[PDB]
Every structure is written in structure tokens, then in C-alpha cells.
Amino acid sequence: LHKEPATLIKAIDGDTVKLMYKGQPMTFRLLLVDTPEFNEKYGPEASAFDKKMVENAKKIEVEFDKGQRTDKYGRGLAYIYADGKMVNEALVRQGLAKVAYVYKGNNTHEQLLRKAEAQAKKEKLNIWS
Ligand SMILES: Cc1cn([C@H]2C[C@H](OP(=O)(O)O)[C@@H](COP(=O)(O)O)O2)c(=O)[nH]c1=O
Numbered sequence: 001l002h003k004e005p006a007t008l009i010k011a012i013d014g015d016t017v018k019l020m021y022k023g024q025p026m027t028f029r030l031l032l033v034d035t036p037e038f039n040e041k042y043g044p045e046a047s048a049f050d051k052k053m054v055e056n057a058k059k060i061e062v063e064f065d066k067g068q069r070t071d072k073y074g075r076g077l078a079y080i081y082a083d084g085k086m087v088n089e090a091l092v093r094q095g096l097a098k099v100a101y102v103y104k105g106n107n108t109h110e111q112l113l114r115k116a117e118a119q120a121k122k123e124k125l126n127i128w129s
């Protein structure tokens with residue numbers, strides 16, 4: 001899999017972000033994770049955490065998996081990196097997201113993320129507290 005450029009347009013919530021990709025605005029939904037909706041517990045913390053990480057980043061990159069690149073809502077599905085660091089991973093590592101929505105064909109970083117959830121759970125962080 002390959003990292004590709006993108007630039008931030010707007011942080012939306014814990015697991016969606018508006019990016020410019022190939023010069024077009026699109027909403028991205030983070031692969032393999034589920035954050036709490038803003039209305040729910042840790043939702044604002046998730047949103048704040050995604051927001052901070054993407055807005056502070058000099059460099060954003062989009063990494064598509066091997067499967068579907070767009071969902072049924074027209075959202076791009078990807079791994080999103082902020083200065084070389086995966087946002088999908090960081091959210092899980094901090095207990096702000098669960099590993100989730102694991103579909104066959106779009107699951108390359110499954111085990112990497114499941115290692116991060118185990119650590120966050122060990123540590124009883126946020127959702128796991
Ligand atoms: C992460 C991801 C979500 N989805 C869809 C399934 C869910 O459908 P439903 O809307 O019918 O529940 C929805 C969950 O995303 P959200 O957590 O943003 O709502 O997005 C995919 O289709 N593929 C994916 O890889």
C-alpha cells in the first residue's frame with residue numbers, strides 16, 4: 001500500500017475528516033475504527049483528538065487499502081497519516097476509538113490496530129476506563 005498526498009480542509013468528528021485529494025474535496029471515513037458520535041461519551045474528546053492531530057500536521061497523507069475506496073455514502077475509505085503517524089492507530093491507542101468495521105479486502109492494518117486497542121485496554125484508557 002502507498003501513501004498519497006492530501007491537504008486538510010476541515011476536521012469533522014472523531015473518525016471523519018474533509019480532505020482535498022487529487023485536487024477534489026472529499027469526506028474521508030477512517031478505516032477499521034469507530035469513534036463515539038459527538039453526542040456520546042468520549043465523542044468530543046475523540047473529535048478533539050482527531051482535530052488536533054490533523055490540524056497540527058505539516059503533512060497529511062491518504063493510504064487506500066486493497067478494496068473499496070469509497071463507501072455507500074460517497075466517503076473515501078482510507079488510513080490517514082499526520083506527519084507519518086496514523087490517525088486511525090493513535091485514536092485506538094488512546095482508547096478514543098474501537099477497532100470496528102473490519103471488512104475482508106480492506107483490512108491490511110487490522111492486527112496493528114488490534115495491538116493498539118490491547119494496549120489502551122491494558123491501560124484502562126478512556127473508553128476502556
Ligand atoms: C468504516 C466503514 C464504514 N462503512 C459504513 C457502514 C455503516 O453503515 P450504516 O450507516 O448503514 O450503519 C457506516 C458506519 O459509519 P459511521 O460510524 O461513520 O456511521 O458506514 C462502510 O461501509 N465501510 C467501511 O469501511
Ligand SMILES: [Ca+2]
Binds near residue numbers: 015034035036037
Ligand atoms: Ca462513528
